[PDB]
């Protein structure tokens, strides 16, 4: 009866406490990973703060089914707010020679302020045509260049880089 | 706008757009030069845009709007002679 080898089979309690050590290290590591990706996913699409409101509009003729309602910006993007009884125009940025420029745009699904349909464009300019085939309406930015940003890289100013 | 004797750093706002920069050749013609937005410089909250030449007139051209930059400090402070941008340079 050599019970001493059973006692020398207790060097894996060192292995036991070290695997509990690296396991709680693993749990705190991926818990910090999940926490920070929760934060950077929550504060990536949060909301934009508005920057200026000084927007006028001028419809030509029978542009009531195309007229925007509440328009503002954030210094980077311009948020148009339509009703739902209105249709969806083709938005255009007036180039400073007077010509037009088709820009990328999307209906923003996150914003539902005041029960509108929000539609952002990715430019800040002074005149915006909203054109369907005959009806159109021109939006005049009388707050152009009054409140810009200083300089940033991401939409919210908690930005990442590599 | 400033320079370092080798590169010329333009500093834009962000409400402005991004022109096509051009170096005026001394006959009066233009010359497209290589340029890049410098990501390291964020002085005064601007968009820095360096070109790789030192000249006297710089056109900044989009389709109808343009602006001419006049170097009234051209050739007043050059370098002596160097090989790299910072003067701790390597060679083989």
Author numbering:
A (entry chain S): 349 to 510
B (entry chain R): 419 to 510
Direct quotes from the study:
The H. pylori Cag T4SS is of particular interest because of its role in translocating CagA (a bacterial oncoprotein) into host cells, an important step in gastric cancer pathogenesis. Here we report the use of single particle cryo-EM to determine the structure of a transmembrane Cag T4SS complex extracted and purified from H. pylori. The structure can be divided into three major regions: the OMCC, a periplasmic ring complex (PRC), and a central stalk. The OMCC has a structural organization markedly different from that of T4SS OMCCs in other species, and there is an unexpected symmetry mismatch between the 14-fold-symmetric OMCC and a contiguous 17-fold-symmetric PRC.
The C-terminal portion of CagX is comprised of two β-sheets preceded by a long helix. This helix extends from the top of the O-layer through the central chamber into the I-layer of the OMCC. The C-terminal portion of CagY is structurally similar to VirB10 and TraF homologs, and the C-terminal portion of CagX is structurally similar to VirB9 and TraO homologs. Both CagY and CagX are much larger in size than characterized VirB/Tra homologs, and correspondingly, CagX has a long α-helix that is absent in the structures of TraO or VirB9 (4, 5). Analysis of the 5.4 Å structure suggests that the connection between OMCC and PRC may occur by contacts between the 14 α-helices extending from the N-terminus of CagX and the 17 unidentified α-helices extending up from the PRC. The tips of these α-helices are presumed to be flexible, since the corresponding densities are not well defined in the higher resolution maps.
